[PDB]
């Protein structure tokens, strides 16, 4: 039996709304550690790593390590039905091929029960070693979404280069060229100016904006997004989940 009670149900809703546009089906792994997920898109160009640590759940019950294969869109359609104020509970009896989503109001005057069928999924899991990236860029999530959306209206590829002069985002297309340079302010005196740019060694890589724009679906999860880059590795775009975990997007470069 599996019973995970999460007080802030809006998180799970925002988490599923994120991953669903990049991945159709994936396994949710439940362990003593927590609720996790790892999957690549159909092309194997991008990868998504999700973690909702056990500490975040007001109640975490997991007798044995298990995996639940799921149609992310379907689970998302179901979670869309819970009120942002609702207390969501994931229940699963290892002996059945169904998972149960309970949605309870704070007052308990409304209790919803959403049963869904699981599915056998044989997904490929990659071993991702930790590494100190050459350049780390922290900026307002809304601004990152802005840059990707804007630049994609101009071209399809974005060259993200980090030097001593800041981080440049450039693209070219049929109508012309466009680049956007962000630099740290004298001080971080407001959210907008919360741009931190760590740069141990200069980096410059090119990526498909279509994928970057898919990662931005996670925007509502946090006000900040962290971008990690190394000259010989896929970029990392991370959004913290509240304070109990995260969603990490990996995107192979164009070389």
């Amino acid at each position: 039996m599996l019973e995970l009670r999460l007080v802030q149900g809006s998180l799970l809703k925002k988490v599923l709304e994120a991953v669903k546009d990049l991945v159709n089906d994936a396994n949710f792994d439940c362990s003593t550690t927590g609720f996790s997920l790892q999957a690549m898109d159909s092309s194997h160009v991008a990868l998504v790593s999700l973690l909702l640590r056990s500490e975040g759940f007001e109640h975490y019950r997991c007798d044995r390590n298990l995996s639940m294969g799921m149609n992310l869109g379907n689970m998302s359609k179901m979670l869309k039905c819970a009120g942002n104020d609702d207390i969501i509970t994931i229940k699963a009896d290892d002996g059945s091929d169904t998972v149960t989503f309970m949605f309870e109001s704070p007052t308990q005057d409304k209790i919803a029960d959403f049963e869904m069928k699981l599915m056998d999924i044989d997904s490929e899991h990659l071993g991702i070693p930790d590494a100190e990236y050459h350049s780390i860029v922290r900026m307002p999530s809304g601004e990152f979404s802005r840059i990707c959306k804007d630049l994609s209206s101009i071209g399809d590829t974005v060259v993200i280069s980090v030097t001593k002069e800041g981080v440049k985002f450039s693209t070219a297309g049929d109508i012309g060229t466009a680049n956007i340079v962000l630099r740290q302010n004298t001080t971080v005196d407001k959210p907008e100016d919360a741009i931190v740019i760590e740069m141990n060694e200069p980096v410059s890589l090119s990526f498909a904006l279509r994928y970057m724009n898919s990662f931005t679906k996670a925007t509502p999860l946090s006000e900040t997004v962290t971008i990690s880059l190394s000259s010989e590795l896929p970029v990392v775009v991370e959004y913290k989940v509240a304070e109990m975990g995260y969603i990490r997007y990996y995107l192979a470069p164009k070389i």
Binding site: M40, S43, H44, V45, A46, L47, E124, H125, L126, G127, I128, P129, A208, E232, L233, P234, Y250, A252, P253, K254, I255
Partner: peptide, 11 residues
């Protein structure tokens, strides 16, 4: 040319 995640990490 677009590379793949598998070009850097493995199962």
């Amino acid at each position: 040319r677009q590379t793949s995640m598998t070009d850097f990490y493995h199962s």
